[PDB]
Design an enzyme around this catalytic site. Structure first.
Site, mmCIF file in Angstrom:
data_model
loop_
_atom_site.group_PDB
_atom_site.id
_atom_site.type_symbol
_atom_site.label_atom_id
_atom_site.label_comp_id
_atom_site.label_asym_id
_atom_site.label_seq_id
_atom_site.Cartn_x
_atom_site.Cartn_y
_atom_site.Cartn_z
ATOM 1 C CB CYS A 434 -0.951 -0.015 1.200
ATOM 2 S SG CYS A 434 -2.206 -1.318 1.118
ATOM 3 C CD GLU A 436 2.681 -1.391 2.953
ATOM 4 O OE1 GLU A 436 1.888 -0.445 2.768
ATOM 5 O OE2 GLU A 436 2.518 -2.522 2.462
#
EC number: 4.2.1.172
Length: 789
Positions: A434, A436
């Site tokens: 997402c 990271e």
């Protein structure tokens, strides 16, 4: 017309979007055969490698009509393999996934029989999920069952990683020679670790042989089909496939076409070796392909159209691979068919200068045309990025299907360096999953599960008792009615946090051992920096960098809750703690005046209001301080990030009413976004609030924003979006992504879903079909603040 720039890719896309989700049992059968042959005769790394090789040697291969890039995880598009070494499903599991309302997978009766008769009897006692659950403490099990946190490794392997550049400079025959050289120099006299190195290196060598066989078999398959195909155009395509597979993956790619096919074979490989989180991704795809593009066009074997056509083929291949089926909590926290294969376009090159190149613009064109929710096609925006590139990305975002998200290149680099990456290595990094942050191809950066920060406050307000599960989940920090000061309450919260993090970390350490011993991944190790040189598998610390994360959920909800308490109970003294606790227990029934105060007459996060935002900072710092720097088993450290996927729905569903006015069982806030109705001062005020969080000290934060379609119209609308991104990133914000939808369309889609099968929205770090979302999640998205400029 139909989406796809060329007749070929229009056809491939239509096959992809019409494929029905189903499970493919062949992988499980072949792994069972390998274990029955080899288990107990070799060390576990070699067992995994031999099992993968057996699977590669014997699985059925397929080439879809019109393909230029070949390879499927399962038997056909949208066919998910199963992974009983990790999670051996029950027959009820199969029933649930076949019949469930959303994210269903069809289970053929032949798949059910084989699973019942061949798979369960062998793997039920071997699956890692039972090794994990049986090793957890009762305190962990109670907290897990109560929704205090989730566990990423219960049904999937750590994964969560991104390809580097090794596969564009070496083939697997080259890597095997590297491995054999390492094996010859092991010193069993003075290196007391030599035996462990040998076992891991031997497994890596077997994994290399498996990749060579993968290419060999596809070339044969292609030629056997070519002899049988009468259409001249198709035969030439089949002959081109065979020629490409003669080179890769055995040898390093020589052409742009071969580079893409090499990546995709590696992708098929690592995601069938294990069911890894976030599948796989080429990461900085435009950086890896641009040398091939420039070379190939100069030599006259490629042009922009064919380069785009090959990438449209690649896009469809991603869209043909669902995340394998999830059940229980894993589904609740990741309720999607997508597998979060995150591509970073733009950014900086390995020298640290502007990375936008011709391939970057081709990728933007294909993601725009294809409009597929896999892969997750995003952009890195640097202070060095041309404004034209940013505005083209905003053009696509404004079309309202969520992609691309925007990531701050300067924040990423500094986040990496704060965590110990060299500047040379940080320039190769980006975001995956997402939001990271990681050092692509050189790091194991493992997410271990979401942490329900708002429910930790709930435990605090109930002296460790969980009002929902009606169990003692936390510790006794005191009756809140006796707290004489806000500082006393916040100290009690920090003690509950410390306890819950201690519980999670202890389970994590056990789980880290289990994955290292029973889920070694020799194939992944061959392409990740330092595993070969160290003689150490990726799953037990072979990567150059090693970090682990706990994902903080609900910072907006808990900020507004603690802000409501400080403002109303301790500062203005409009009511006391006893009254607040009665109001919460009654879901504000009979306490409407209290509800009005905390909802409508109290400072809120996301308004550039320091009364609330300083509390956000205190909460954030406590979380950062409690987690960061704790050691991992395999020689790294823990760090912190902030994203929810769909876990903010689950975490709110098993929580009572909270002091900010959120009612019982409602979702908590998503990412670092404001609470529902919290931000009333426009989008500039919220990016100013979000920038007060120190993004550089995290491994990434997630910010959703939503705009009225009328306020982003025309060139001024594009500039307003572009300027908001630049403003946020100039304050070192990490990430932002946009919804742009007409509320009435979403409401109509709820009444008549069959008329809106194409409607796609942004959830949290990914896009999905609106019809794939629960009513609660749909309503969460609809309730997000509609911003104006």
């Amino acid at each position: 017309m139909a989406r796809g720039t060329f007749e070929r890719t229009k056809k491939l896309r239509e096959e992809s979007i019409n494929a029905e989700p189903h499970i493919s049992i062949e992988r499980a059968v072949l792994m069972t055969e390998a274990y029955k042959k080899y288990e107990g005769s070799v060390e576990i790394p070699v067992l995994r490698a031999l099992s993968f090789k057996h699977y590669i040697e014997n699985r059925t291969l397929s080439i879809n009509d019109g393909e230029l890039i070949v390879g499927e995880k399962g038997d056909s598009p949208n066919g998910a393999p199963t992974y009983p070494e990790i999670c051996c499903h029950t027959m009820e599991d199969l029933e649930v996934m076949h019949n469930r309302d959303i994210i269903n997978f069809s289970v053929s009766e032949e798949a059910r029989k084989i699973h019942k008769e061949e798979i369960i009897p062998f793997w039920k006692k071997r699956q890692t999920r039972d090794k994990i659950i049986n090793a957890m403490t009762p305190e962990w099990l109670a907290a897990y069952e109560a929704g205090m946190f989730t566990e990423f490794m219960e049904q999937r392997a750590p994964g969560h990683t991104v390809c580097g550049d090794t596969i564009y400079k070496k083939g697997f025959l080259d890597l095997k020679k590297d491995i054999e050289a390492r094996l010859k120099e092991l010193d069993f006299l003075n290196d007391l670790d030599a035996y462990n190195k040998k076992a891991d290196l031997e497994a890596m060598a077997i994994a290399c042989d498996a990749m060579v066989i993968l290419g060999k078999r596809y070339a044969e398959k292609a030629r056997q089909m070519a002899e049988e195909e009468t259409d001249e155009a198709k035969k030439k395509d089949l002959l081109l496939i065979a020629e490409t597979c003669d080179v890769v993956p055995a040898h390093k790619p020589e052409t742009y076409h071969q580079a893409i096919q090499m990546y995709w074979f590696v992708h098929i490989g690592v995601t069938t070796e294990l069911n890894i989180w976030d599948a796989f991704t080429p990461g900085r795809l435009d950086q890896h392909l641009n040398p091939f593009y420039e070379r190939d066009v100069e030599n006259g074997i490629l042009d922009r159209d064919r380069a785009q056509e090959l990438l449209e083929c690649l896009w469809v291949k991603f869209n043909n691979q669902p995340a394998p089926p999830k059940v229980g909590i894993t589904l609740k926290e990741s309720s999607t068919y997508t597998d979060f294969a995150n591509i970073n376009t733009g950014g900086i090159n390995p020298d640290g200068q502007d990375g936008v190149n011709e391939v970057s613009y081709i990728i933007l064109d294909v993601m725009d045309e294809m409009k597929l929710i896999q892969p997750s096609s995003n952009v890195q925006i640097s202070k060095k990025t041309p404004q034209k590139f940013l505005k083209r990305a905003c053009e696509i975002s404004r079309k309202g299907w969520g992609q691309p998200a925007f990531y701050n290149t300067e924040a990423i680099v500094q986040e990496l360096m704060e965590a110990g990456k060299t500047i040379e290595d940080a320039r190769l990094g980006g975001t995956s999953g997402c939001v990271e942050t990681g050092c692509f191809g050189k790091e194991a950066y493992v997410l271990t599960g979401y942490m329900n920060i708002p429910k930790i406050l709930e435990l605090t307000l109930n002296n460790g008792y969980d009002p929902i599960s009606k169990k003692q989940i936390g510790i006794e920090t005191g009756d809140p009615r006796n707290f004489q000061s806000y500082e006393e309450l916040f100290e009690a919260f920090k003690k509950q946090l410390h306890y819950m993090i201690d519980i999670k970390i202890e389970g994590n350490a056990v789980i880290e051992n289990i994955c290292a011993k029973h889920m070694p991944c020799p194939l992944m190790s061959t392409i990740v920096d330092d595993c070969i040189e160290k003689g150490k598998d990726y799953q037990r610390g072979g990567a150059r960098y090693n970090t682990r994360y706990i994902q903080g959920v609900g910072i907006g909800t808990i900020t507004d809750s603690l802000t409501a308490i400080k403002y109303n109970v301790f500062d203005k003294k409009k009511f006391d703690m006893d009254t607040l606790l009665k109001a919460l227990d009654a879901n504000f029934e009979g306490y409407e005046a209290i509800l009005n105060l905390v909802s409508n007459k109290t400072p809120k996060y996301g308004n550039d209001d320091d009364y609330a935002d300083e509390i956000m900072q205190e909460i954030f710092n406590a979380y950062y301080n409690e987690v960061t720097g704790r050691p991992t088993v395999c020689g790294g450290e823990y760090r912190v990030d902030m994203l929810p996927t769909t876990c903010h729905i689950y975490f709110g569903e098993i929580m009572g009413a909270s002091p900010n006015g959120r009612l019982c069982a409602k979702p908590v806030s998503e990412g670092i976004s404001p609470e529902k109705g919290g931000d009333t001062n426009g989008p500039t005020a919220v990016i100013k609030s979000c920038a007060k969080m120190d993004h550089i000290k995290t491994g990434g934060t997630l910010l959703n924003q939503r705009f009225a379609p009328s306020v982003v119209q025309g060139e001024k609308g594009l500039d307003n979006m572009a300027n908001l991104v630049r403003a946020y990133f100039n304050m070192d914000g990490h990430h932002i992504q946009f919804n742009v939808f007409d509320k009435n369309v979403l409401l109509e889609a709820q009444k008549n879903p069959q008329d809106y099968k194409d409607l796609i929205v942004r959830v949290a770090g990914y896009s999905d079909h609106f019809n794939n979302l629960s009513r609660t999640l749909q309503d969460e998205i609809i309730g997000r603040t509609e911003q104006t400029f």
